[PDB]
Structure 1
Amino acid sequence: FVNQHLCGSHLVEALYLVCGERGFFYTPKT
């Protein structure tokens, strides 16, 4: 696997693929 530059919705697309049915948390800095 390679490293990624991921902004915005692309980050959540990546989490979706990495985690699959495990699900995930999307937690930006506030």
Structure 2
Amino acid sequence: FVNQHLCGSHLVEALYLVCGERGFFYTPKT
């Protein structure tokens, strides 16, 4: 695999693919 530059919704898409049925948490800094 390669490193990736992911902003906005693209990060969410990547988490979805990496985690699959495990699901994930999306937690940006506030």
- TM-score class, shorter: over 0.9
Give the aligned length. 30
Deviation at 1:28, TM superposition (A): 0.1
Superposed CA offset, 1:1-30 (max 9, x none): 000000000000000000000000000000
In the alignment, structure 1 segments of 5+ residues that lack a partner are none
Which sections of structure 2, spanning at least 5 residues, go unmatched?
Answer: none
Q: Which structure shows the bigger proportion of residues in strand conformation? A: 2
C-alpha RMSD of the superposition: 0.2
Distance 1:24 1:3 in 2: 19
